[PDB]
Symmetry: D2
Subunit: 226 residues, 4 copies
């Protein structure tokens, strides 16, 4: 039987634009209480926004605090993701590598860490990490991006191993080419932000309870491999 | 913006019992038109049943035709294993024939109508276990994954996708008849520290049959409480 | 501290032609005692040949027995596909029977002697292609991987390991008879930007047959110039 | 036919102790010219040592320079690896996460970057990254370690995608439990440093030319999965 809906306290990081925005809007339409973080550009009409730079652990702490006061402790964390600085390995700098790692990977650790306490205590948690945006498949021109997104999957699986006994799961959505190279895609087209948002809606629902440590590709078949 | 619901013609093989039954009843409550295959015992009230042994290509043809006349051409195929329970050539070949070749038989029979109508969802249900290292069961379930990926690559241009749901340890009518020692013994290998329900599997199949699953193809979704993590 | 070399009794199925031939000649130059199966044409000078159709369990038994009398019990088994080249139930089942069930047949026949002697290396050679998304070939090669992992899990306690070598696009006698359009066309999908050689495959098999491979079991090694990267 | 031996210029980072030392000694016995980096404890008798902290990009540059003067440009890079600081996600600090990421992941980027120029120019390169030391399989107690080792695999595959056309490959050796929990291992025993070293010897040889982007588990079967 289909489990009854529960309106969850949702935080979507980088939920003001692109895929993050479509996630945020879908989760709100689903009936959840949705908050987003942003860099300054503001949150969309309707939804609760807080400014947060995910490279700053204290700014992550006060974004969560603000969210808990507004709508209750975060039950569903959607970690978008992120940045985007490419380059040939030979031309790629230490600075470019570390900034993408700090935003995309360590940033994911920061928001996950800040959520884990309350999720554990309350015996409910859904951590959903959004790859940007083509992976496991070695692309670029982007040693930094590939490293951060593969690292998020390893991180998620470690969290999943640790916290699944407490009904706190961690899963990854791996988008391919999304419209916010067609030769490599069996669907022969790019996906939409809504097509990503629907997989996140599923992972944020009562139907996803026995999924944990999973990586769900949303790429029209592009990254089939090993 | 959730895509509007579309009532699909659904066929669930081995959908009169266990996980197949939970799946068929979920897809039905979801609003789809749901038929099941069975091997004689009958389909349960509220679902159109047809008899079909998936080792038999002509039986598979007849089952699909019977379904098409009743509720229209199969738009979503759910292939539930076949044979489930634990070495000889005979044991190897029978599980392969039912689990892998049987999966090919139903997929191939579904394919022309799906390509033609520019819509198809093939959803293959792994038997309870892998993929993780059952020589026959492990071969057949690994093989269905390869088959599905091959189909996804061929047919995704025509909006015909193929995906796999890989259940871990799920509470059935035989998992319960299992020895208490192996039941708990397996709990040390599942991070969730509990068995999953047939409804927890039906849930994922509901999602893959829905309009939200359009851009997923060639995927394997584990429903195993984290058991299968690795490479 | 390289472990000292041990001359092993080796059987390479389909080892009289193409990749199987390169493998058998490498293992022989390495210093092993090498036998090959063939389907009538004969084994080449310098290798003990026996006839064996791997769809036939009794032929497999006879081949192993003939090998054991000649050079001692099989310590390293190299299972080379069978059938290679490109849909019906008949086409699906024949490739499955030769490529997957055939792999099970040779593995099962090797197993008791290996467990008993506390040494075994089973090395399964994928046909040229996957695993990447050929519905029959893709199913069978995915299936051998699952089988091998199942065997590795069962038998690794007894120093009997099972591993897979997954070749990409390799220059054979038919890859060359392929259309020039598909040869180059595939080069856009291989980071190395070139086809691999039969010797490049034999090289990996040499390593997995050696004393340096002791702690590898359940692994899949791609020899594909990076073609197969993904998940 | 077996390709003739070529004595390669080898650099093994953290080649003074444990698995790194066994790698270094095996490659030297194979007939290569082997140099190691270390933290201060010195290199072993026979082998060329240079001090290098892989968190320091300028110290990576002068270690390579010293190596090129001694024995010629580095043709085979073995990136060990690394650190080791565990903790429950809730108790894991930003500082602990970032230091393991900086040593194990960004450190791997630094040595790979510093090698890529000359390998590309000379149309030969073997980059071999050593996981420490159990992965893809979500362990711990170690979100940081899991993230760094999964990230190295994504990085390697990006390098492999970029440089394989130039005969510069990048591969990963993923050790399980090595003696420098048995319930999870089909072999029913830990491996040895030499059993790791032998896979690296193979990846550093003329037989490995058509392998690139690969992850080779050396774990007695422990991490079989997806
Ligand atoms: Cs709402
Ligand atoms: Cs709604
Ligand atoms: Cs209905
Ligand atoms: Cs309903
Ligand atoms: Cs010989
Ligand atoms: Cs030799
Ligand atoms: Cs030497
Ligand atoms: Cs030597």
């Amino acid at each position: 039987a289909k489990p009854p809906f529960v309106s969850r306290s949702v935080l979507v990081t980088g939920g003001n634009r692109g895929i993050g925005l479509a996630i945020a809007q879908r989760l709100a339409a689903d009936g959840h209480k949705v908050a987003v973080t942003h860099r300054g550009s503001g949150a969309p009409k309707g939804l609760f926004g807080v400014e947060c730079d995910v490279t700053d652990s204290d700014a992550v702490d006060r974004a969560f605090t603000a969210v808990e006061e507004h709508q209750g402790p975060v039950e569903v964390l959607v970690s978008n993701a992120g940045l985007s600085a490419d380059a040939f390995l030979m031309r790629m700098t230490e600075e470019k590598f570390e900034k993408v790692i700090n935003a995309n990977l360590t940033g994911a650790f920061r928001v996950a860490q800040r959520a884990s306490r309350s999720m554990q205590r309350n015996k409910f948690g859904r951590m959903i990490f959004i790859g940007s945006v083509s992976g496991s498949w070695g692309i670029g021109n982007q040693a930094n991006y590939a490293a951060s997104k593969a690292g998020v999957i390893g991180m998620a699986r470690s969290i999943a191993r640790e916290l699944s006994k407490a009904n706190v799961t961690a899963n990854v959505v791996a988008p391919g080419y999304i419209d916010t190279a067609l030769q490599f895609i069996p669907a022969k087209r790019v996906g939409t932000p809504a097509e990503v948002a629907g997989v996140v809606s599923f992972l944020a629902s009562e139907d996803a309870s026995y999924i944990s440590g999973a990586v769900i590709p949303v790429d029209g078949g592009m990254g089939m491999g090993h």
